[PDB]
Short mmCIF file of C-alpha atoms and ligand atoms in Angstrom, two decimals:
data_model
loop_
_atom_site.label_atom_id
_atom_site.label_comp_id
_atom_site.label_asym_id
_atom_site.label_seq_id
_atom_site.Cartn_x
_atom_site.Cartn_y
_atom_site.Cartn_z
CA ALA A 14 0.00 0.00 0.00
CA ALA A 15 1.06 3.73 0.40
CA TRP A 16 1.44 5.69 3.66
CA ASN A 17 3.11 8.55 5.49
CA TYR A 18 3.02 10.43 8.76
CA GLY A 19 2.22 13.48 6.74
CA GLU A 20 1.93 16.99 8.02
CA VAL A 21 -0.13 18.59 10.69
CA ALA A 22 -3.81 18.20 9.82
CA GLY A 23 -5.16 21.63 10.71
CA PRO A 24 -3.69 24.24 8.32
CA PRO A 25 -5.14 22.86 5.04
CA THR A 26 -8.62 23.23 6.61
CA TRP A 27 -8.31 26.86 7.81
CA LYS A 28 -11.13 28.95 6.27
CA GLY A 29 -11.69 32.41 4.84
CA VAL A 30 -8.70 34.32 3.57
CA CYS A 31 -6.52 31.39 4.63
CA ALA A 32 -7.90 29.45 1.67
CA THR A 33 -8.87 32.21 -0.78
CA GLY A 34 -6.27 34.95 -0.42
CA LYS A 35 -3.42 35.32 -2.94
CA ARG A 36 -0.97 37.27 -0.71
CA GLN A 37 -0.57 34.62 2.02
CA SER A 38 2.46 33.87 4.22
CA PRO A 39 4.84 32.17 4.52
CA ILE A 40 6.65 31.71 1.23
CA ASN A 41 9.82 30.30 -0.16
CA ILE A 42 12.45 33.00 -0.46
CA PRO A 43 14.90 32.29 -3.27
CA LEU A 44 18.54 33.18 -2.67
CA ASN A 45 20.68 31.14 -5.01
CA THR A 46 18.34 31.92 -7.89
CA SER A 47 19.74 33.13 -11.24
CA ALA A 48 16.46 35.05 -11.56
CA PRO A 49 17.16 38.85 -11.09
CA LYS A 50 15.97 40.49 -7.90
CA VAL A 51 14.06 43.72 -7.28
CA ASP A 52 15.97 45.90 -4.80
CA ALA A 53 13.92 47.14 -1.86
CA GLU A 54 15.76 50.50 -1.70
CA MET A 55 14.47 50.94 1.86
CA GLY A 56 17.81 51.21 3.60
CA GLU A 57 18.54 49.57 6.92
CA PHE A 58 16.50 48.91 10.05
CA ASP A 59 17.13 50.97 13.15
CA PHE A 60 15.85 49.87 16.56
CA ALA A 61 14.55 51.81 19.57
CA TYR A 62 13.32 48.98 21.77
CA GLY A 63 13.66 50.65 25.16
CA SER A 64 10.35 50.24 26.95
CA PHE A 65 10.95 46.49 27.36
CA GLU A 66 10.92 46.02 31.10
CA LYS A 67 7.47 45.04 32.39
CA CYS A 68 6.36 42.34 29.93
CA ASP A 69 3.47 39.93 29.91
CA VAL A 70 4.06 36.29 28.83
CA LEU A 71 0.92 34.66 27.41
CA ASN A 72 0.08 31.06 26.53
CA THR A 73 -1.90 31.33 23.35
CA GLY A 74 -3.22 27.79 23.39
CA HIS A 75 -1.78 27.47 19.90
CA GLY A 76 1.59 26.05 20.72
CA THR A 77 3.77 29.14 20.99
CA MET A 78 4.00 31.52 23.92
CA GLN A 79 3.49 35.24 23.13
CA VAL A 80 5.47 38.07 24.74
CA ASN A 81 3.35 41.28 24.88
CA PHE A 82 5.14 44.59 25.03
CA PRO A 83 3.85 47.91 26.31
CA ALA A 84 3.66 50.88 23.92
CA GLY A 85 6.92 52.68 23.12
CA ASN A 86 9.15 50.15 21.45
CA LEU A 87 9.82 51.44 18.00
CA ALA A 88 11.72 50.28 14.95
CA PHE A 89 12.32 52.37 11.78
CA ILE A 90 12.81 51.24 8.20
CA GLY A 91 12.35 53.35 5.11
CA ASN A 92 10.32 56.31 6.22
CA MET A 93 8.08 53.87 8.11
CA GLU A 94 7.65 53.74 11.90
CA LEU A 95 6.90 50.34 13.48
CA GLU A 96 5.55 49.95 17.00
CA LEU A 97 6.30 46.55 18.59
CA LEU A 98 3.20 44.75 19.92
CA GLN A 99 4.34 41.24 20.66
CA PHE A 100 6.78 38.51 19.69
CA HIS A 101 6.39 34.76 19.47
CA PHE A 102 7.99 31.77 17.73
CA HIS A 103 7.46 28.89 15.27
CA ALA A 104 9.25 25.50 15.01
CA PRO A 105 10.43 24.66 12.46
CA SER A 106 10.61 28.03 10.65
CA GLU A 107 7.66 29.22 8.64
CA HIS A 108 9.56 30.86 5.78
CA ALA A 109 12.08 28.88 3.80
CA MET A 110 15.26 29.74 1.97
CA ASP A 111 15.63 27.76 -1.24
CA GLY A 112 13.29 25.08 0.04
CA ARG A 113 15.01 24.80 3.31
CA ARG A 114 13.50 25.60 6.68
CA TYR A 115 15.28 26.37 9.95
CA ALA A 116 14.85 25.11 13.53
CA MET A 117 12.87 28.12 14.65
CA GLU A 118 11.53 31.42 13.29
CA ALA A 119 11.05 34.39 15.52
CA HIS A 120 8.15 36.73 14.73
CA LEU A 121 8.20 40.33 16.01
CA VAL A 122 4.79 41.72 15.25
CA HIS A 123 4.39 45.49 14.92
CA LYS A 124 1.71 48.03 14.28
CA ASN A 125 2.78 49.89 11.13
CA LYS A 126 2.12 53.50 12.14
CA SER A 127 2.62 54.65 8.54
CA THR A 128 0.31 52.32 6.64
CA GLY A 129 -2.15 51.25 9.29
CA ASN A 130 -1.16 47.61 8.49
CA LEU A 131 0.81 45.16 10.62
CA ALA A 132 4.49 44.60 9.99
CA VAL A 133 6.12 41.26 10.92
CA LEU A 134 9.87 41.01 11.37
CA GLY A 135 11.05 37.43 10.97
CA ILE A 136 14.31 35.94 12.18
CA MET A 137 15.72 32.46 11.65
CA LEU A 138 16.96 30.48 14.66
CA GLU A 139 19.61 27.83 14.04
CA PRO A 140 21.12 25.21 16.39
CA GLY A 141 24.79 25.62 17.39
CA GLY A 142 24.57 28.36 19.95
CA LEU A 143 26.99 28.65 22.82
CA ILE A 144 24.89 31.24 24.75
CA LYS A 145 21.23 30.80 25.62
CA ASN A 146 19.23 33.55 23.90
CA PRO A 147 18.04 35.69 26.82
CA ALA A 148 14.74 36.81 25.34
CA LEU A 149 13.86 33.28 24.20
CA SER A 150 15.05 31.95 27.59
CA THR A 151 12.86 34.32 29.65
CA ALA A 152 9.94 33.62 27.33
CA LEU A 153 10.48 29.94 28.05
CA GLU A 154 10.93 30.30 31.86
CA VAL A 155 8.02 32.66 32.50
CA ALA A 156 5.45 31.24 30.05
CA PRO A 157 2.44 29.78 31.89
CA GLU A 158 2.05 26.06 31.23
CA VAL A 159 -1.69 26.58 31.79
CA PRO A 160 -3.18 27.43 28.35
CA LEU A 161 -4.71 30.92 27.80
CA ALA A 162 -3.02 32.04 31.03
CA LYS A 163 -0.77 35.10 30.95
CA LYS A 164 1.58 36.31 33.64
CA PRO A 165 4.00 39.29 33.92
CA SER A 166 7.70 38.64 33.41
CA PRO A 167 9.69 39.52 36.51
CA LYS A 168 12.77 39.95 34.39
CA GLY A 169 13.10 42.45 31.56
CA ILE A 170 12.88 41.08 28.02
CA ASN A 171 14.93 42.80 25.36
CA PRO A 172 13.51 42.03 21.91
CA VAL A 173 16.59 43.41 20.13
CA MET A 174 18.19 40.12 21.23
CA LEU A 175 16.03 38.32 18.65
CA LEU A 176 17.63 40.37 15.81
CA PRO A 177 20.62 39.06 13.85
CA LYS A 178 23.99 40.83 14.31
CA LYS A 179 25.09 43.52 11.83
CA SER A 180 27.27 42.37 8.91
CA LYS A 181 30.80 43.57 8.18
CA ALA A 182 29.16 46.46 6.35
CA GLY A 183 26.75 47.80 8.96
CA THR A 184 23.79 45.90 7.49
CA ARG A 185 21.20 43.26 8.37
CA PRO A 186 20.14 41.92 4.96
CA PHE A 187 16.47 41.10 4.52
CA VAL A 188 13.68 40.48 2.11
CA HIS A 189 10.45 42.37 2.09
CA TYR A 190 7.13 41.25 0.69
CA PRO A 191 3.42 41.79 1.22
CA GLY A 192 1.67 38.83 2.83
CA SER A 193 -0.60 37.76 5.63
CA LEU A 194 -0.76 36.48 9.16
CA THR A 195 0.34 32.81 9.14
CA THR A 196 -2.55 31.83 11.42
CA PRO A 197 -6.30 32.31 11.17
CA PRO A 198 -7.96 34.50 10.14
CA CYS A 199 -4.78 34.99 7.96
CA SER A 200 -5.71 38.61 7.31
CA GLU A 201 -3.72 40.14 4.47
CA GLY A 202 -2.01 43.50 4.17
CA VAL A 203 0.90 42.51 6.39
CA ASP A 204 4.35 43.76 5.49
CA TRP A 205 6.86 40.90 5.91
CA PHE A 206 10.55 41.50 6.55
CA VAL A 207 12.55 38.27 6.81
CA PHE A 208 16.19 38.65 7.78
CA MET A 209 18.69 36.49 5.97
CA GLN A 210 21.19 36.10 8.81
CA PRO A 211 20.11 33.39 11.26
CA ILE A 212 20.94 33.63 14.94
CA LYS A 213 22.60 30.55 16.45
CA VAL A 214 20.94 29.07 19.51
CA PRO A 215 21.80 26.27 21.91
CA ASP A 216 19.89 23.13 20.91
CA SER A 217 18.52 23.00 24.43
CA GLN A 218 16.33 26.02 23.65
CA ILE A 219 14.98 24.69 20.37
CA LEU A 220 14.01 21.42 22.21
CA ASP A 221 12.65 23.45 25.14
CA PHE A 222 10.42 25.35 22.71
CA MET A 223 9.18 22.30 20.76
CA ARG A 224 8.46 20.92 24.24
CA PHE A 225 6.39 23.97 25.14
CA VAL A 226 4.51 23.54 21.85
CA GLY A 227 3.74 19.99 22.90
CA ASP A 228 1.83 21.01 26.07
CA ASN A 229 4.93 20.03 28.08
CA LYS A 230 4.20 16.34 27.45
CA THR A 231 5.68 15.74 23.95
CA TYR A 232 7.62 17.51 21.21
CA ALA A 233 5.65 19.26 18.44
CA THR A 234 5.63 21.78 15.61
CA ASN A 235 3.50 24.89 14.94
CA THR A 236 4.16 25.93 11.35
CA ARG A 237 2.04 26.58 8.29
CA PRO A 238 2.92 25.16 4.91
CA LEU A 239 4.46 27.40 2.24
CA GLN A 240 2.09 29.45 0.08
CA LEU A 241 2.13 30.50 -3.58
CA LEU A 242 3.90 33.74 -4.39
CA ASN A 243 1.31 34.34 -7.15
CA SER A 244 1.45 37.97 -8.47
CA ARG A 245 3.91 39.24 -5.87
CA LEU A 246 7.61 39.68 -6.21
CA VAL A 247 10.04 39.57 -3.29
CA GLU A 248 12.14 42.66 -2.58
CA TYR A 249 15.71 42.13 -1.43
CA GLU A 250 17.76 44.53 0.66
CA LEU A 251 20.95 42.48 0.55
CA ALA B 5 -11.30 28.00 17.11
CA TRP B 6 -8.53 26.50 14.93
CA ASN B 7 -5.33 24.49 15.34
CA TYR B 8 -2.25 23.04 13.77
CA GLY B 9 -3.21 19.53 14.91
CA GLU B 10 -1.50 16.16 14.73
CA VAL B 11 0.01 14.77 11.56
CA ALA B 12 -2.72 13.76 9.10
CA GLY B 13 -1.21 10.45 8.02
CA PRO B 14 -1.82 7.87 10.84
CA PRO B 15 -5.54 8.42 11.31
CA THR B 16 -5.97 7.35 7.66
CA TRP B 17 -3.86 4.17 7.91
CA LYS B 18 -6.09 1.19 7.17
CA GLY B 19 -6.15 -2.55 7.71
CA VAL B 20 -5.47 -3.85 11.21
CA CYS B 21 -4.01 -0.35 11.81
CA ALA B 22 -7.54 0.95 12.03
CA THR B 23 -9.44 -2.06 13.40
CA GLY B 24 -7.14 -3.87 15.83
CA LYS B 25 -7.88 -3.91 19.55
CA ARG B 26 -4.22 -4.72 20.42
CA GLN B 27 -2.32 -1.79 18.92
CA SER B 28 0.92 0.03 19.72
CA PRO B 29 2.17 2.33 21.05
CA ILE B 30 0.40 2.85 24.36
CA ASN B 31 0.81 4.69 27.60
CA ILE B 32 2.83 2.91 30.30
CA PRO B 33 1.37 3.87 33.69
CA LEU B 34 3.97 4.14 36.42
CA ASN B 35 2.80 6.35 39.17
CA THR B 36 -0.83 5.24 39.00
CA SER B 37 -3.26 4.11 41.70
CA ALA B 38 -3.93 0.91 39.87
CA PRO B 39 -2.34 -2.34 40.85
CA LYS B 40 0.75 -3.28 38.89
CA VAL B 41 0.83 -6.95 37.94
CA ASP B 42 4.45 -8.17 38.04
CA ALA B 43 5.66 -9.80 34.86
CA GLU B 44 7.98 -12.20 36.70
CA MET B 45 10.10 -12.79 33.72
CA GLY B 46 13.56 -12.24 35.12
CA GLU B 47 16.00 -9.74 33.74
CA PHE B 48 17.20 -9.34 30.18
CA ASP B 49 20.56 -10.87 29.42
CA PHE B 50 22.21 -9.35 26.37
CA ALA B 51 24.81 -10.91 24.15
CA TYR B 52 25.15 -8.26 21.46
CA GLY B 53 28.31 -7.93 19.32
CA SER B 54 30.44 -4.82 19.79
CA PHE B 55 31.38 -3.88 16.16
CA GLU B 56 28.80 -5.34 13.89
CA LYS B 57 29.04 -4.86 10.16
CA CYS B 58 25.59 -3.51 9.26
CA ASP B 59 23.51 -2.35 6.23
CA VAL B 60 21.89 1.04 6.85
CA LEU B 61 18.61 1.47 4.98
CA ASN B 62 16.53 4.62 4.36
CA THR B 63 13.03 3.44 5.11
CA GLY B 64 11.54 6.33 3.29
CA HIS B 65 9.16 6.89 6.24
CA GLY B 66 11.37 9.11 8.34
CA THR B 67 13.86 6.95 10.17
CA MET B 68 16.92 5.16 8.84
CA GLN B 69 17.07 1.48 9.70
CA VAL B 70 20.18 -0.43 10.86
CA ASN B 71 20.16 -4.10 9.86
CA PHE B 72 22.26 -6.71 11.63
CA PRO B 73 23.73 -10.11 10.99
CA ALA B 74 22.80 -12.99 13.27
CA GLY B 75 24.55 -13.41 16.61
CA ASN B 76 23.02 -10.54 18.51
CA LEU B 77 20.88 -12.27 21.10
CA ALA B 78 18.76 -11.01 23.94
CA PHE B 79 17.61 -13.57 26.58
CA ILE B 80 14.40 -13.12 28.62
CA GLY B 81 11.82 -15.29 30.34
CA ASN B 82 13.50 -18.43 29.00
CA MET B 83 13.27 -17.28 25.36
CA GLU B 84 15.81 -16.28 22.74
CA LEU B 85 15.27 -13.04 20.85
CA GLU B 86 17.54 -12.29 17.90
CA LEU B 87 18.14 -8.71 16.73
CA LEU B 88 17.01 -8.10 13.21
CA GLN B 89 17.32 -4.26 13.02
CA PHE B 90 17.02 -1.04 14.90
CA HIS B 91 15.46 2.40 13.98
CA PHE B 92 14.06 5.53 15.66
CA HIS B 93 10.98 7.64 16.32
CA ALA B 94 10.75 11.30 17.39
CA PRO B 95 9.13 12.12 19.72
CA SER B 96 8.94 8.77 21.60
CA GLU B 97 5.93 6.64 20.54
CA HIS B 98 5.32 5.20 23.90
CA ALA B 99 4.40 7.64 26.64
CA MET B 100 4.89 7.33 30.38
CA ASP B 101 2.20 8.85 32.54
CA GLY B 102 1.08 10.74 29.47
CA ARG B 103 4.51 12.16 28.65
CA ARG B 104 6.68 11.39 25.62
CA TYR B 105 10.48 11.62 25.37
CA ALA B 106 12.61 13.21 22.68
CA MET B 107 13.19 9.92 20.85
CA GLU B 108 12.55 6.22 21.30
CA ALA B 109 14.79 3.53 19.87
CA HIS B 110 13.22 0.37 18.61
CA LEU B 111 15.36 -2.80 18.51
CA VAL B 112 13.37 -5.37 16.60
CA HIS B 113 13.88 -9.09 17.20
CA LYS B 114 12.76 -12.45 16.01
CA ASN B 115 11.83 -14.69 18.90
CA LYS B 116 13.70 -17.84 17.75
CA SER B 117 11.72 -19.96 20.22
CA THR B 118 8.41 -18.76 18.64
CA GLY B 119 9.09 -17.13 15.29
CA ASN B 120 7.00 -14.10 16.32
CA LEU B 121 8.40 -10.54 16.47
CA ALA B 122 9.52 -8.81 19.67
CA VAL B 123 10.43 -5.10 19.97
CA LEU B 124 12.52 -3.43 22.62
CA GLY B 125 11.76 0.23 23.20
CA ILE B 126 14.31 2.55 24.80
CA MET B 127 13.52 6.23 25.53
CA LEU B 128 16.11 8.80 24.49
CA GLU B 129 16.23 11.86 26.69
CA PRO B 130 17.92 15.14 25.92
CA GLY B 131 20.72 16.46 28.12
CA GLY B 132 23.41 14.01 27.15
CA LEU B 133 27.01 15.23 26.96
CA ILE B 134 28.25 12.22 25.07
CA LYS B 135 27.30 11.44 21.51
CA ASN B 136 25.70 8.05 21.32
CA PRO B 137 27.81 6.24 18.70
CA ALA B 138 25.15 3.90 17.33
CA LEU B 139 22.72 6.72 16.60
CA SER B 140 25.73 8.66 15.36
CA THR B 141 26.85 6.13 12.82
CA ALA B 142 23.22 5.52 11.76
CA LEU B 143 22.79 9.23 11.00
CA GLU B 144 26.15 9.39 9.15
CA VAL B 145 25.77 6.28 6.94
CA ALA B 146 22.05 6.75 6.10
CA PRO B 147 21.59 6.88 2.33
CA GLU B 148 19.74 9.98 1.09
CA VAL B 149 17.73 8.12 -1.58
CA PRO B 150 14.50 6.63 -0.13
CA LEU B 151 14.39 2.78 0.01
CA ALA B 152 18.12 2.63 -0.77
CA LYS B 153 20.72 0.98 1.50
CA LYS B 154 24.44 1.32 2.04
CA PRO B 155 26.78 -0.86 4.06
CA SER B 156 28.46 0.94 6.98
CA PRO B 157 32.21 1.22 7.16
CA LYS B 158 32.14 1.52 10.92
CA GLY B 159 31.02 -1.17 13.30
CA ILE B 160 27.96 -0.54 15.39
CA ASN B 161 27.50 -1.50 18.98
CA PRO B 162 23.74 -1.97 19.52
CA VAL B 163 24.21 -2.32 23.28
CA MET B 164 24.79 1.43 23.22
CA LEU B 165 21.05 1.77 22.62
CA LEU B 166 20.24 0.02 25.92
CA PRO B 167 20.07 1.55 29.38
CA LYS B 168 22.83 0.87 31.92
CA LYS B 169 22.10 -1.63 34.64
CA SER B 170 20.86 0.12 37.80
CA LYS B 171 22.54 0.02 41.20
CA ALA B 172 20.85 -3.33 41.75
CA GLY B 173 22.06 -4.68 38.40
CA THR B 174 18.57 -4.46 36.91
CA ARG B 175 17.24 -2.99 33.65
CA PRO B 176 13.60 -2.60 34.69
CA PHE B 177 11.01 -2.77 31.97
CA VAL B 178 7.40 -3.41 31.13
CA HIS B 179 5.94 -6.06 28.87
CA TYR B 180 2.71 -5.98 26.92
CA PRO B 181 1.26 -7.53 23.75
CA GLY B 182 1.05 -5.08 20.87
CA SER B 183 1.56 -4.31 17.20
CA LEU B 184 3.90 -2.82 14.65
CA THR B 185 3.49 0.97 14.88
CA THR B 186 3.44 1.41 11.09
CA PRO B 187 1.28 -0.28 8.43
CA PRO B 188 0.25 -3.09 8.25
CA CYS B 189 0.27 -2.46 12.03
CA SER B 190 0.33 -6.24 12.38
CA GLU B 191 -0.45 -7.43 15.94
CA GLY B 192 1.07 -10.43 17.80
CA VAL B 193 4.24 -8.47 18.61
CA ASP B 194 5.76 -8.66 22.07
CA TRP B 195 6.70 -5.21 23.32
CA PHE B 196 9.29 -4.67 26.02
CA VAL B 197 9.85 -1.11 27.09
CA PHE B 198 12.64 -0.03 29.24
CA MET B 199 11.87 2.35 31.98
CA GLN B 200 15.18 3.98 32.12
CA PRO B 201 15.89 6.49 29.39
CA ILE B 202 19.33 7.13 27.97
CA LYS B 203 20.72 10.66 27.66
CA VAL B 204 21.88 11.62 24.21
CA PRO B 205 23.04 15.10 23.17
CA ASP B 206 20.46 17.64 21.95
CA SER B 207 22.53 17.92 18.77
CA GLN B 208 21.63 14.30 17.92
CA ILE B 209 17.91 14.55 18.62
CA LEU B 210 17.84 17.55 16.26
CA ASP B 211 19.99 15.73 13.68
CA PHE B 212 17.42 13.04 13.68
CA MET B 213 14.47 15.37 13.37
CA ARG B 214 16.41 16.89 10.48
CA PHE B 215 16.83 13.47 8.79
CA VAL B 216 13.07 12.93 9.15
CA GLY B 217 12.65 16.31 7.45
CA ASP B 218 14.87 15.09 4.63
CA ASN B 219 17.48 17.81 5.41
CA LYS B 220 15.07 20.64 4.50
CA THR B 221 13.02 20.90 7.70
CA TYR B 222 12.44 19.26 11.12
CA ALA B 223 9.69 16.66 11.25
CA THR B 224 8.37 13.91 13.46
CA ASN B 225 7.67 10.20 12.65
CA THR B 226 5.54 8.93 15.49
CA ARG B 227 2.17 7.26 15.62
CA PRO B 228 -0.34 8.50 18.12
CA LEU B 229 -0.93 6.59 21.37
CA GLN B 230 -3.40 3.68 21.26
CA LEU B 231 -6.07 2.31 23.64
CA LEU B 232 -5.01 -0.42 26.02
CA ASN B 233 -8.41 -1.99 25.64
CA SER B 234 -8.76 -5.29 27.42
CA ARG B 235 -4.99 -5.64 27.75
CA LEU B 236 -2.76 -5.76 30.79
CA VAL B 237 0.68 -4.13 31.13
CA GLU B 238 3.02 -6.33 33.24
CA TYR B 239 5.91 -4.88 35.27
CA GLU B 240 9.44 -5.86 35.93
CA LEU B 241 10.65 -3.13 38.14
C1 LIG C 25 -2.59 40.78 16.62
C2 LIG C 25 -1.60 39.86 15.92
O1 LIG C 25 -0.43 40.19 15.92
N1 LIG C 25 -2.06 38.70 15.35
C3 LIG C 25 -1.22 37.77 14.69
N2 LIG C 25 -1.52 36.61 14.09
N3 LIG C 25 -0.61 35.90 13.52
C4 LIG C 25 0.67 36.29 13.52
S1 LIG C 25 2.07 35.71 12.61
N4 LIG C 25 2.48 34.19 13.22
O2 LIG C 25 1.55 35.47 11.30
O3 LIG C 25 3.18 36.55 12.91
S2 LIG C 25 0.51 37.83 14.42
C1 LIG C 26 9.22 -6.08 9.30
C2 LIG C 26 9.10 -5.08 10.43
O1 LIG C 26 9.73 -5.26 11.45
N1 LIG C 26 8.32 -3.99 10.25
C3 LIG C 26 8.16 -3.02 11.22
N2 LIG C 26 7.43 -1.91 11.22
N3 LIG C 26 7.37 -1.09 12.19
C4 LIG C 26 8.07 -1.35 13.27
S1 LIG C 26 7.96 -0.73 14.88
N4 LIG C 26 8.23 0.89 14.72
O2 LIG C 26 6.63 -0.98 15.29
O3 LIG C 26 9.11 -1.28 15.53
S2 LIG C 26 8.85 -2.88 12.80
O1 LIG C 27 25.50 20.62 15.40
P1 LIG C 27 24.61 21.50 16.35
O2 LIG C 27 24.36 22.94 15.65
O3 LIG C 27 23.20 20.78 16.53
O4 LIG C 27 25.28 21.70 17.78
O1 LIG C 28 25.27 -8.58 28.83
P1 LIG C 28 24.31 -7.85 29.85
O2 LIG C 28 22.84 -8.35 29.62
O3 LIG C 28 24.67 -8.15 31.33
O4 LIG C 28 24.45 -6.30 29.63
O1 LIG C 29 25.82 -11.96 31.11
P1 LIG C 29 26.78 -11.04 31.90
O2 LIG C 29 28.22 -11.59 31.87
O3 LIG C 29 26.83 -9.54 31.30
O4 LIG C 29 26.32 -11.04 33.40
O1 LIG C 30 20.24 20.22 27.81
P1 LIG C 30 18.72 19.95 28.08
O2 LIG C 30 18.08 21.23 28.73
O3 LIG C 30 18.00 19.65 26.73
O4 LIG C 30 18.53 18.72 29.04
ZN1 LIG C 31 4.14 33.90 13.73
ZN1 LIG C 32 9.63 1.68 15.43
#
């Protein structure tokens, strides 16, 4: 006969824009493509994440924990101003780079003060890290095991720590594209910025997270399959 | 109200897979308020070679599969089990008081007394500071092409996939009648599950999850827990 373990059963049954939209996330992000690449001409991100003491850690009942920030944490790119709302994680990564996913993907979700949209910053987490990632760590420690339950972090959580390090040219290369939320209702009009430089992380933390995703009784994943690019193009700021 | 869910594959599996009342894996109650019936079976005695020349196969269903020659014998309850092959599942397929471990190793045997299959399950825990060399070689030698096999250059010591003897010289375990955990999910299999996990490095658990994801993602290859039904788990603690 013919059989597999297959993928998680839920995502191909999500309704509304999840099924109908044509600007859905995530997507494959070509790198080693011969195909020529539209430059984003947006310049480089600058971060003003200061108001990061006093955080809530929330158990979404959807695998990941969610760190909620108070107003005042700002990032700038192009002329646009981005106010940080929350961050969370996916394992394995949601976006892919030439077909290949990573151990985790961090999602920093912002209100886009300039467009009225949301903007999601996306960072790849790789295994190999010698230092625990402090933001990830605290998110792991504080996160209520009871689902739906949220409780305030006693430690401060610096979300800049989820950003890749600057290159040997001042930059943090990224791709930009219009897409959606990767969970229901998958609303569109989200600006996606996926950085190309992964951050290394001790394997303990990746297993700790997949453990959290598995209700602390197994190891599990919380990722959506890749979606068609369709009419879009991806903008590179390499 | 929406979710990611469990993998979509196993609930569709047909045959005995879907109809059997004696299926694996199951939950192994330890700290329960129910009486534990002792298996009274004695302890395992292992005579496994230390540097076996093995074929490593890519099952094309997640795990690689290490095949052995004859000579690797496990003795229990006055029976002779011979090792056919090992492979892995991530997370563990058995649970223990509801909880699964990072991986489970399955050492499959032919009961030479009976001719029926027996499987030994060992939990693999993260935390380990020492690379387990059997899992290591199995990851290294595993052919990339599905259903292909390649002989290993290095010997494999399958005893490395078994837990150390305790302070009292035991390797406590549980015994129950079950099935293959993959189609045809044939029943009549004797399951022995060791209570003591082995620590392996987090690197290797991830390597394995990577293999299951065919080097492009991180996946699992575990069947969901089954109902004990009318069955009894017997204990050798
Ligand atoms: C209010 C809000 O931020 N909702 C989100 N839903 N999904 C997100 S994701 N995984 O696509 O970044 S963010
Ligand atoms: C021939 C044979 O042994 N087939 C098996 N299929 N699944 C196995 S498991 N995971 O239940 O040990 S063994
Ligand atoms: O090889 P590592 O990146 O899993 O330590
Ligand atoms: O050879 P063993 O069964 O004592 O390890
Ligand atoms: O069978 P033994 O020699 O390991 O006790
Ligand atoms: O190193 P640990 O935290 O995975 O046991
Ligand atoms: Zn997300
Ligand atoms: Zn198995």
